[PDB]
Amino acid sequence: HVNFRFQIDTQPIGTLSEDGEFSRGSHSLPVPTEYAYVTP
Amino acid sequence: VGIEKNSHIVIFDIHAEYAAAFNLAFTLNLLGVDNLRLPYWLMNAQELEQIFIESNEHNSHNQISQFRHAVVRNKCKHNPTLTNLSFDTPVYFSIDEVVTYLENMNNEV
Amino acid sequence: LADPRLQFLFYPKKEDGEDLATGDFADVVRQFVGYMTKSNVSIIDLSGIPFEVLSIVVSLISRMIFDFGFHYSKNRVPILVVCEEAHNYLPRSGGAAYDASRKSIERIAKEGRKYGVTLMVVSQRPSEVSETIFSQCSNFISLRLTNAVDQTYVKSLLPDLSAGLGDLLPNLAQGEFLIVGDAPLMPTVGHFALPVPEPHDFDSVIDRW
Amino acid sequence: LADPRLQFLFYPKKEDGEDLATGDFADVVRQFVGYMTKSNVSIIDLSGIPFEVLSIVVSLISRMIFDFGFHYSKNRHVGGAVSDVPILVVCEEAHNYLPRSGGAAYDASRKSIERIAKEGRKYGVTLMVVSQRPSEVSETIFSQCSNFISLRLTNAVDQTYVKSLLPDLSAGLGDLLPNLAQGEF
Amino acid sequence: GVTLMVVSQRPSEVSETIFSQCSNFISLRLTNAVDQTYVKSLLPDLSAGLGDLLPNLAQGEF
Amino acid sequence: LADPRLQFLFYPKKEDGEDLATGDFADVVRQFVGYMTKSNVSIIDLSGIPFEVLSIVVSLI
Incomplete structure (x- = not known):
């Protein structure tokens, strides 16, 4: 606080599609201005 | 190995995971435990020491000398053809005979 | 001697x-x-062999496989020895139980090319394998390596690996590899196709007992 | 002999x-x-036995059970199947009676259990080991285990070791061990 | 009055006793690290800035 | 001795x-x-010689 600012740091672990498959190991890079969700 | 020239492969396989890959031009001696054949006497000096000798006895190297030249004696008995024999020599012999040889050392009078 | 197996x-x-x-x-x-x-393939199966007699067998076979080639190429068809699960019987530091083998293998790694005998090593835990053997390996192939220690350890061995090529290892996908050494023209990333065929009443017993 | 127990x-x-x-x-x-x-849980208590000759007892028991498994699995070797009667052996506080620093009286038992670790998987015998003092035990046995479970570890001399073993470890998650809350794994 | 000349594809193998005698040294492109870092210790007037150029030399560069 | 080489x-x-x-x-x-x-460049060529005795060969030369 100096407004509020919260920073979280994360490490990639794999990929999940829409249908539901889970592939371990990733090659993609997410561009900025993209949303982060909490795992349901 | 041209599957989809002379070259020989030997595979150490602890988990036994490789038989299925090669089952189909090239020989396939699929060795196993019982199928195996191996003599005790081919070994060299130090594993001859390893398998049976143990070091707990404190004057054991008396027995090491006894052993080492004993088997030489037994081979020169079983190798009248050969001269100036020693232990390291991996030539045919029998170990029950050396067992009796050392047994007579208990039978001493 | 009464021991049956x-x-x-x-x-x-x-x-x-x-x-x-x-x-x-x-x-x-x-x-x-x-x-x-009509060159052939040999498959030793070590599961049945007891654990206390495991090192000696392999030292003996190494002796033979080495000296046969010595005597066959003195006056003048190579053979290769593939050691899976290496670290079980070639530790970094260990007692006598596994020393008998350490000596047989290391010598080849010192010099055995002249004869046509050559080794191959497989290790799921490369760090716990001993010092001498690796350094005498021309090419290296690496798949995914998640654990932290091995990242640094393997980064040390091959300095051709750029500063950044190390970060690539944990993100490697199913069947993707990095090869570095003398054989390739340039360091490259590659993919593997799948293999075909793939690798894979007490009285009654006490009667035998 | 006069000892009635x-x-x-x-x-x-x-x-x-x-x-x-x-x-x-x-x-x-x-x-x-x-x-x-049919499912058979079979408990064994070792408290009454005097703490002098426990090792010999456990050694004999393990020997018998392993041999049994081996022979049934050989009848199956000729039967072309895996032995469908598997056994699990739970050993709590083995670090008492399977140390890094052990006397001969312990050795004559150690080896027995060691056997079951290195080859038993083939014939159908499995171990579960439970401890409070992780580093204290011989690394030999603990090296064979494949899956692992960890709770809070406020101690450090014991902390730093386990961090060496577990396979899929990351730097960030590891440092959570000391500050865990009870009932967490 | 008797002198020697040596040529080696890979230097670090051979007994260093023989190399230590030599006074003048010539070098071509060198890539392998175990073969590389050893040489640097032998040659007399080597520096970091020039040594760094050793690996990326072109063919026929000495 | 039978060796022709x-x-x-x-x-x-x-x-x-x-x-x-x-x-x-x-x-x-x-x-x-x-x-x-008027010195000349004598050349030794060791390709033909067997690879068994080369070590013993060079020393005396």
Whole structure:
């Protein structure tokens, strides 16, 4: 606080599609201005 | 190995995971435990020491000398053809005979 | 000697039923080598062999596989020894139990090319494998390596690996590899296709007992 | 012999009172295996046995059970199947009686259990090991385990070791161990 | 009055006793690290800035 | 001795074919060193020789 600012740091672990498959190991890079969700 | 020239492969396989890959031009001696054949006497000096000798006895190297030249004696008995024999020599012999040889050392009078 | 399963070491039989004779020494040697034409494959299965007699067997086989080639190429068809689950029997630091083998293998890594004998090493935990063997390896192939220590350890061995090529290892996908050494023109990333075929009443018993 | 608390193994007898005969040595197995086909939990308590000769006991028991498994699995070797009677052996506080620093009286038991770790997987015998002092035990046994479970570790001399073993470890998640709350794994 | 000349594809193998005698040294492109870092210790007037150029030399560069 | 490769050394024979003797040691070196003046580049070639005795070969030379 100096407004509020919260920073979280994360490490990639794999990929999940829409249908539901889970592939371990990733090659993609997410561009900025993209949303982060909490795992349901 | 041209599957989809002379070259020989030997595979150490602890988990036994490789038989299925090669089952189909090239020989396939699929060795196993019982199928195996191996003599005790081919070994060299130090594993001859390893398998049976143990070091707990404190004057054991008396027995090491006894052993080492004993088997030489037994081979020169079983190798009248050969001269100036020693232990390291991996030539045919029998170990029950050396067992009796050392047994007579208990039978001493 | 009364130990049943170890019998094969002391008193073996042929098909006829005879005790082994010295003449068939070469014969048992050619149990490994085989014919010079129509080269063949050999598969030792070590599961049945007891754990306390495991090192000696392999030292003995190394001795033979080495010296046969020595004597065959003195006056003048290579052979290769593939060691899976290496670290079980080639530790970094260990007692006598596994030393008997350490000596047999290391010497080849010192010098055995002249004969046509060459090694291959497989290790799921490369860090716990001993110092000498790796350094004498020309090419290296690496798949995914998640654990932290091995990242640094493997980064040390091959300095051709850029500062950044290390970060690539944990993100490697199913069947993707990095090869570095003399053989390739340039360091490259690659993919593997799948292989075909893939690798893969108590009274009654006490009667036998 | 005068010790009355060691008579049972010296004088093991049925309610009939008849002495042991080698002709029948099946019952000694029966109690451990329990049954042919139905779930059999079979507890064993070692408190009463004097703390002097525990190792010899455990060694004999393990020897018998492993041999049984081996022979059934060989009848299956000729049967072309895996031995469908598997056994699990839970060893709590083995670090008491399977150390890094052990005397001969312990050695004659250690080896036995060691056996089951290195080859038993083939014939159907599995171990579970439980500890409070992780580093204290011989790395030999603990090296064989494949899956692992961890709770809070406020101690450090014991902390730093386990961090060496577990396979899929990351720097960030590891540092959570000391500050965990109870009932967390 | 008797002198020697040596040529080696890979230097670090051979007994260093023989190399230590030599006074003048010539070098071509060198890539392998175990073969590389050892040489640097032998030659007399080597520096970091020039040594760094050793690996990326072109063919026929000495 | 049966080896045909190694006989050149075992059996050295001159232009005339006379037996070898200690009478002429000096001549044997003359080929390596060559002339006194107008020196020439003698070449040893070791490809043909077997790879078994090469170590023993070089030392005396």
